[PDB]
């Protein structure tokens, strides 16, 4: 298919590129909902108070670390969705007259030089014979 380009900041994407990322992001969200569900639960347990106060404090620690991490992921992905621009590519032969003329000037320019250079080479290869 086609095009995707992220420099980490803003992202350039085309139709198939956009469908692709929405795939990846939709999935990523599903993973976030799973991660959230697991933490909402563990937190709910820890709350109960099922033995060993010191073990509970260490647990909250790990959890509080996890929720925070979650928050970083979530925000990063949302940053992504927001800096995602859709592009459409237009081919040389389908560009504005102004652009076509600019290229042609140059193509003709180069083409003439290959002809002349060819002739030059054959003039060179002759003499040295």
From Swiss-Prot:
Occurrences of domain BAG (ranges): 35-121
Domain of life of the organism encoding this protein: Eukaryota
Annotated keywords: Chaperone
Segments traversing the membrane: none
GO biological process, one term: chaperone cofactor-dependent protein refolding
GO molecular function: adenyl-nucleotide exchange factor activity; ATPase activator activity; protein-folding chaperone binding
GO CC aspect terms: cytoplasm; cytosol; membrane; nucleus
Protein purpose: May inhibit the chaperone activity of HSP70/HSC70 by promoting substrate release in an ATP-dependent manner.
Domain observations: The BAG domain probably mediates direct interaction with HSP70.
Name by which UniProt lists this protein: BAG family molecular chaperone regulator 1
Organism of origin: Caenorhabditis elegans
Record lineage: Eukaryota, Metazoa, Ecdysozoa, Nematoda, Chromadorea
